[PDB]
């Protein structure tokens, strides 16, 4: 993967190129207003050490932060999301993997068309990396999920449990 991040809008000002996860971009860039993704799938974070608001970016050019749906010019850590060949996830109605459950191996643009819960309170990533979204059609807050256990909603970094769509990360 390769991404170039620029301080100024329209691919200007001081820039910095990443090829791996970077937990602290502050020594190399004091703001981020445009980005170019040459390869791979990336997650940008508003705060350092993979903290704060998250934004998914795929191969392409982003002339301003609103183009990746950011609300500010704070990008302070990033992750190169790992490729997978298969994806499988389970979502649960309540904490600790109880209540009604649903599984996906495809993208789901609208969770409520399959499930009947505006909120999801635990989940299991069995394969592949996924971006979870607060709202249907891949809108609202974004949360990266990677293979592993998520037993409450605060484990994917949310402060609420709204989930309305789910996308597989693919290159």
From Swiss-Prot:
MF GO annotations? structural constituent of eye lens
Q: What is the effect of changing residue 58 to H?
A: In CTRCT4; lowered solubility; crystallizes easily
Q: Does the keyword Repeat apply?
A: yes
| UniProt keyword annotation of Repeat present | yes
- Write out the GO biological process terms: cellular response to reactive oxygen species; lens development in camera-type eye; lens fiber cell differentiation; visual perception
Single GO cellular component annotation?
Answer: nucleus
Q: Which residues form the Beta/gamma crystallin 'Greek key' domain?
A: 1-39, 40-82, 87-127, 128-170
Q: What is the effect of changing residue 23 to S?
A: In CTRCT4; reduces solubility
User: Span of the secretion signal?
Assistant: none
Q: InterPro entries, from UniProt?
A: Beta/Gamma-Crystallin (IPR050252), Beta/gamma_crystallin (IPR001064), G_crystallin-like (IPR011024)
The UniProt entry, under Pfam families, shows: Crystall
Keywords linked to the UniProt accession: Cataract, Disease variant, Eye lens protein, Repeat, Sensory transduction, Vision
Tell me which PANTHER family the record gives. BETA/GAMMA CRYSTALLIN, GAMMA-CRYSTALLIN D
Physiological role = Crystallins are the dominant structural components of the vertebrate eye lens.
Q: What is known of its domains?
A: Has a two-domain beta-structure, folded into four very similar Greek key motifs.
Which family does the similarity line name?
Belongs to the beta/gamma-crystallin family.
Q: How does it assemble?
A: Monomer.
The disease tied to this protein in UniProt is: Cataract 4, multiple types: An opacification of the crystalline lens of the eye that frequently results in visual impairment or blindness. Opacities vary in morphology, are often confined to a portion of the lens, and may be static or progressive. CTRCT4 includes crystalline aculeiform, congenital cerulean and non-nuclear polymorphic cataracts, among others. Crystalline aculeiform cataract is characterized by fiberglass-like or needle-like crystals projecting in different directions, through or close to the axial region of the lens.
Q: What protein name is recorded for this chain?
A: Gamma-crystallin D
Classification from the root reads: Eukaryota, Metazoa, Chordata, Craniata, Vertebrata
Gene of this entry: CRYGD
């Amino acid at each position: 993967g390769k991404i170039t991040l620029y301080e100024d809008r329209g691919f200007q000002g001081r820039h910095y190129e990443c090829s791996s996860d970077h937990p602290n971009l502050q020594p190399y860039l004091s703001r981020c207003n445009s980005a170019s993704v040459d390869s791979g799938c990336w997650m940008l974070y508003e705060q350092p050490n993979y903290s704060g608001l998250q934004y998914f970016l795929r191969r392409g050019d982003y002339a301003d932060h609103q183009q990746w749906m950011g609300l500010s010019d704070s990008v302070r850590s990033c992750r190169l999301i790992p490729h997978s060949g298969s994806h499988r996830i389970r979502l649960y109605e309540r904490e600790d993997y109880r209540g009604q459950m649903i599984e996906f191996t495809e993208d789901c643009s609208c969770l409520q068309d399959r499930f009947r819960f505006n909120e999801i309170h635990s989940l299991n990533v069995l394969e592949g990396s996924w971006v979870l979204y607060e709202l249907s059609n891949y809108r609202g807050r974004q949360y990266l999920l990677m293979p592993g256990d998520y037993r409450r909603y605060q484990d994917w970094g949310a402060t609420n449990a709204r989930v309305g769509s789910l996308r597989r990360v693919i290159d």
